[PDB]
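Regression check, adenosine monophosphate case 1623:
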Amino acid sequence: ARQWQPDVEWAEQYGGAVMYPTKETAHWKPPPWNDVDPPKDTLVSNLTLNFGPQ
Amino acid sequence: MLKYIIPTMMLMPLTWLSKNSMIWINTTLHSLLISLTSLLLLNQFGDNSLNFSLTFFSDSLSTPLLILTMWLLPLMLMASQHHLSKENLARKKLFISMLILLQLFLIMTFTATELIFFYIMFEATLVPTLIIITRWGNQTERLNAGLYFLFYTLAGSLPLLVALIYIQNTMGSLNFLILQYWVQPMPNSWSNTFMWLACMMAFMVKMPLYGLHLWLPKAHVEAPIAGSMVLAAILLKLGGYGMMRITLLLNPITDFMAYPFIMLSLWGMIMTSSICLRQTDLKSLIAYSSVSHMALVIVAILIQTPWSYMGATALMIAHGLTSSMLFCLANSNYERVHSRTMILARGLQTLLPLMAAWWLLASLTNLALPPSINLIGELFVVMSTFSWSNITIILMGLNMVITALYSLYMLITTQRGKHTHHINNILPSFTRENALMSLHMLPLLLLSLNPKIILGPLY
Amino acid sequence: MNPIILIIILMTVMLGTIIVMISTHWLLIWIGFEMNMLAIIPIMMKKHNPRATEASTKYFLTQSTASMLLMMAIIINLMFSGQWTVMKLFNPMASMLMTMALAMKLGMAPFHFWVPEVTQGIPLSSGLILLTWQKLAPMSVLYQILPSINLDLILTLSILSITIGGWGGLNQTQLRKIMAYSSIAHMGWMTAVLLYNPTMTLLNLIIYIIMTSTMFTLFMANSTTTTLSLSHTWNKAPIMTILVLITLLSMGGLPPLSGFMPKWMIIQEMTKNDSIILPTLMAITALLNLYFYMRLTYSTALTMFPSTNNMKMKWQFPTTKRMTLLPTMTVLSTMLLPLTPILSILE
Amino acid sequence: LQYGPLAYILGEKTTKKMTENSKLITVDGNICSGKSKLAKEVAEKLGLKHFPEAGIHYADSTTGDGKPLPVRFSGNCSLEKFYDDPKSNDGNSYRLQAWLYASRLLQYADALEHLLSTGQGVVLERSIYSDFVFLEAMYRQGFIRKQCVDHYNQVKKVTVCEYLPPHVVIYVDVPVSEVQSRIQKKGNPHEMKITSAYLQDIENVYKGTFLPEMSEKCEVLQYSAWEAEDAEKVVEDIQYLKYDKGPWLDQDDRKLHNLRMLVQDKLEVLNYTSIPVFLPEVTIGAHQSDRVFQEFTELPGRKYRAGYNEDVGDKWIWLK
Amino acid sequence: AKTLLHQYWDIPEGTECHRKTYAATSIGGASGLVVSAYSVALKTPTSFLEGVARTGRYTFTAAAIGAIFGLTSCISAQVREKPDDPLNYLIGGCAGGLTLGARTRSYGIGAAACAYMGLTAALVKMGQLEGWKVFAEPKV
Amino acid sequence: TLRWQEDPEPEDENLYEKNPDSHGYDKDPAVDVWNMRVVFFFGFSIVLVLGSTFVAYLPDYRMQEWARREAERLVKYREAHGLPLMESNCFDPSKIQLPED
Amino acid sequence: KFYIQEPPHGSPNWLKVGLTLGTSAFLWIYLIKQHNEDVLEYKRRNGLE
Amino acid sequence: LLDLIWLETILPKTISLAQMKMSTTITSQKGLIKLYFLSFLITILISTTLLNFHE
Amino acid sequence: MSLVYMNIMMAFTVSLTGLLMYRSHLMSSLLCLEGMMLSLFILATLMILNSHFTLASMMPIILLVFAACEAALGLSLLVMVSNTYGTDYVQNLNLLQC
Ligand SMILES: CCCCCCCCCCCCCCCCCC(=O)OC[C@H](COP(=O)([O-])OCC[N+](C)(C)C)OC(=O)CCCCCCCCCCCCCCCCC
Ligand SMILES: CCCCCCCCCCCCCCCCCC(=O)OC[C@H](COP(=O)([O-])OCC[N+](C)(C)C)OC(=O)CCCCCCCCCCCCCCCCC
Ligand SMILES: CCCCCCCCCCCCCCCCCC(=O)OC[C@H](COP(=O)(O)OCCN)OC(=O)CCCCCCCCCCCCCCCCC
Ligand SMILES: Nc1ncnc2c1ncn2[C@@H]1O[C@H](COP(=O)(O)O)[C@@H](O)[C@H]1O
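Current build output:
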């Protein structure tokens, strides 16, 4: 009898990165909330030098 | 027309500076006073129309629509003050301001002597209606009803503007008083074919036309009572007024061009009446009846004879009043039983006698019982379409039977038979509801005494 | 970022755009474009996150390619004319190269690929600064070389930009991508009417700048980036929902709002030159922009989306942001129709 | 506002008003570790302003008239309801945890604003760097679900990265049996329902996850129960610390100015607490939120801004 | 592409079916080449063979649509002795739509393509008859 | 498990329970009575009775009476002098030029 | 005293109020003077005195 | 049959599904700079030779 | 025109089609940008010295200055990239696709 207002089902449609998903848009995660990504620190590869006997 | 625009605009400081619970009383009182002062537009002459200034003029065609709009606003405020009793005060003031703004745009639409100004107000009526439907409705599907109502109308009206601008580059002016003397015949060509389509399809969409009517059963049954009133009784007549204004420039190409739309409406009246014979919803039944009556008005305008024009405007006024009454009846039943099913609440004559009398009277005026103006308009359209061709009367006559096959049916399932056993919240009829139905019906019954004021600009 | 350095950089951006606007030499035009790009790069690098680095790299590559094409066309015009006056060109190849370079600088399709990604990867301040201020100098350069652009090329670019922006705006939930696709569609709308009467182009530019600034400033005030927070805004301040509702109704080209100001009169300039198919197609395509504007209004204002418990605390703290010129800008973007002949001052 | 970029340009630097005594101290411990008065002792020996532990009604005391709001307007959670039945079906536990964490974020923002604006150190109790430990106990006892942990981790990740750790953290080591004895001597009937396993898990996540990860970015001072009863040793140990670790060392005036710009905007601080992620514990429906908001608006002193309320006695409104 | 349209349009309608069909085939092949070039640009195929297969498929589909449209339009114009009539172009557009449905191996696509391309071809013939302009030279 | 913490749906309100003399306008009896009086006075005693009186006494609408009376003169002209009642040509044939054919 | 903390707008900013009133008065008198000289010079040019 | 399916199919649902399909096709790019600049080169190649925009 | 003009324009087009098709390396695109700048410089000074426009000899050198005003800038837009990822590949710059 009350006026209908949207629930989590109507509000969760817009929560994705895209509105109509496709096969290509399958791994598209949404952007972060603060748009700051983890640094994904790779191996820095310090060069190994042989200050040898000669 | 500045003596009617200014009080309508001043209604908003009335509804925003009012007390905590005195908004409805003040708005109803002052809108009824505006409706009383609206009768000064009856200064019509047998040859000359009433011209106020370079922007506003009132013929004998726009005057009944103006009077109907300014009469409908207090009835609208009376109708929409029961399901908004739990609403916020700011939201209530916003709703009243929306109704006032919509009425202002409506009374500025009909008096426009320029077709561009008329078109601008004709699209400016879209925004408050869409806002009302999508905000103060009850179901979910109103959101869908906010799309089909919108993107239909603009899809008809965005080409038409271009055609209107073309006239501004061709005839030198778009003033209706000038164009009555500077009009030119339209030769048969593909360019004039598509210009006719551009100038007409907006008014076929907003009337509506069968095939393009799909937005009307959706925007009538999710909308609130005030929205249902504004769609049924006024907003479907913008297409008819635009047709009557724009048919002057589209001659003589209309003689062979109007055939497919005439056939579409002549079959759509039968199709929509048959749909009304099997509808499970009261509101959808009233919507499809509105579609059928406006298809009849489309036929009347397209055959363009004086009797057809007279029947068209009489049918417009009568259908507006009758559809408003039927929608208020449906709203009262919906407020009492909290559902829209026709078969749910039966045998209401044993519980509400006066509402049964109002239902019987509204169904009587729906099937055009003489000498009501419904019968006057429908009869004159029938005479004109018999003059047009001798076979179309069959396509009229059968339709009449189907009308009497659903309206009384809409009576019986809601009024007669054994009452349902598990419904025991049937309250007695309020004074406000009975006042609403009497204010809807008594002008309609009184107009049968003097119908010469609603017989168009060529009476 | 130091406030002194930020003020100096913003003044450099303004000086570069002014140098493009007021100079009568092609080399000075290119110098102003280079200064504008160099001083607009670090604005997008304000927060030092990776997405800013991708956006800056893509923007820099596109702008460098556009500047190279612009200088090549300038050199070809010098070869074929022997002067430097900023006026009509004397080689169709130079005109084509300048039109391509200015289309890449304006982000017009099919050079529109960088616009939504750059707009999404940068903050709202840099996004507003880009999408409003950086679209002033190339429009002025297009205004100056009016008797030189090929009609077919610029009209094809305009209709392509309008169609591509209208199609791309439907499938987005981020607000910045929606604004970028809207900017592309409006770019096509301005360049559609440029060759007929550029006064309508200037009117459309002013109106589009006002509406885009209003929407971006409302996004600042509500601190929203996605559609869900914009929906959640109804719990904090409903006046903001009213303002974004009337603004998004304005940008849809719905009368009697000021967004009906350019487009209608744009049609008024295409029928005088016997072009009736193109304005009809352009309005039919702008219906898509109206569609996703209506979707945004349904999500934000006309429906009451669910909220969270923590918003209760936000009821105890009023907004203390510097909403500069927001009511004036909303009033200009909504109720400017009855002052329609004011555009006669733009001649 | 009062402090802006024009003020920083005109000469109002941040490091000029920051002396050596400006230190941020977070005193920590168990439920009844006795730190609640001990920190106050460190308030009255070093001359530092004391902030009590941020409860449900911290924001109610911060703004308005200072009186606590009703629970239906602020918090929508009860600590006693959690203490009676921690496995309640309405999700009271995670709602209380989220409200407490957001209140602690507000308290940390207020303390950082006071420290950066006045140069006087602030003494806190159980700041945002040591709240998740409580959450871990709620996960180890099965009081909440994994989605609550994921949402809390998302909120913490998007919020805590814009702030700074405290200079000194003090941990009061009290065993579980002594904590239970102090709780039984407290006399609060709702606190007697705390299980021994909950306090044991709190101690385990304090000693295993908080302190090993916290001692790199600041300096720890672990104290026993007997040593926390004498504040002279605590203040003497605080006054002779060689601050060399932590991100406070490499701070210019620009970084502190940006931190003060972000901190002094309270809605910017609480922007990411209410992320639109739909969880049964925290999601409030449309009609309930509408009713609560409309009832909150009509409260005295809350309808308009903090100086435009005629029902409380604010004058010269028409000239403001 | 200016010379291809001029080559197709200067041939009288319903006179030489083969040259008109060849011109329409060339127009369709050019449009399909543009479409396939953009497709292999933006969406990279996994191999060279897949890319050339997609290019050949798009070009053959568009060429078949254009060839059947031109042949059907010329056949209708010869059969009806109505060269300046858009209904022949409507028939050719529907034939091209049926060809598109056959190439896509579906019926609803064929029906929709028939309807929309028949309307588009009728509009193109209408504009050629009435002298409509799509890219209007500015005059005022 | 309790998705969507929500207030329960309130029951229907009967205006006759707290006030059996309710006209259906407002739950406050004085406001309801005054609204009823305003509606029944300005809806029936002002815009219907006086409105119908104004419409009934319209001063010669569309000169529909006058066109009769002038006709009552005009026939009495042309019947008196033997003229035909109506000519087949609306305009005088002497003042209109036809194209050559 | 009601609020537990001093609001930033508890007392009216008198210098801002004075600046606003002075700016409004100066703009009004400047517009009136400009209109008077404009209509006077228009009457002088066309001789419509 | 007619007013609930077919009239609801020919006009509104066809354009609705076409706009959905075109919106999915347009915005399905991978976000790579190399493909975008290759499309730029192909656009320049089309404009120079096939469309004769340099005349 | 002449012959060296044709060769310099051919060099510009060669460097343009070198730039527009990337090969998964940002430095190569920067080298292509420098090459197009050099070709434009050479064409401009060839035309200027042929036509004896002496007062425009300020043009090319000043033009050359603004080369660094992007080119060195490009290097400053690389080091953060090379701090975000271990290499400078252009396929790693695809985070802005959603
Ligand atoms: C609601 C759904 C249905 C909507 C139907 C709306 C109407 C259908 C027809 C509209 C045609 C477009 C407007 C035409 C205005 C013509 C004015 C004029 O002066 O014409 C003479 C002019 C004549 O050209 P001219 O005036 O420039 O030349 C001088 C005159 N001659 C030719 C003698 C030299 O006609 C035209 O310019 C062409 C008119 C046809 C245009 C065809 C393209 C549009 C096709 C229809 C698209 C409709 C929308 C579809 C999508 C809807 C949303 C989903
Ligand atoms: C117009 C468009 C908007 C529509 C909505 C309007 C809303 C606002 C409404 C305002 C008020 C109403 C305006 C219209 C008024 C129409 C009435 C009117 O004035 O008519 C003028 C007509 C005028 O008649 P007339 O034109 O013949 O007279 C010449 C004119 N005068 C009066 C100046 C001499 O009034 C009448 O006909 C009244 C006649 C006397 C009263 C009735 C007597 C008979 C009653 C019934 C007897 C029993 C019959 C059998 C019953 C069996 C059981 C059912
Ligand atoms: C024919 C050619 C016509 C040319 C006309 C030229 C007119 C003048 C130039 C207009 C162009 C835009 C100028 C402003 C660009 C954007 C400035 C900007 O983004 O400033 C940032 C600032 C941030 O404020 P804050 O919220 O404190 O900071 C958040 C943390 N970053 O502030 C904001 O984000 C808030 C917004 C501040 C500026 C709003 C007002 C100016 C822009 C809109 C135009 C208003 C109407 C006046 C001009 C009409 C014609 C365009
Ligand atoms: N995040 C939290 N979750 C549950 N209870 C808490 C939390 N933070 C503090 N408390 C309670 O606060 C009280 C400790 O305050 P105090 O006695 O002053 O040290 C104990 O009852 C704790 O259970």
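Comparison notes: Residues 1-320 of chain D form one domain. Residues B 152, 155-156, 159, 162-163, 166, 191, 194-195, 197-198, 201, 205; C 274, 276-277, 280, 284; E 123, 130-132; H 15 surround 1,2-diacyl-SN-glycero-3-phosphocholine (ligand 1) (CB under 6 Å). No diff flagged against the previous build.
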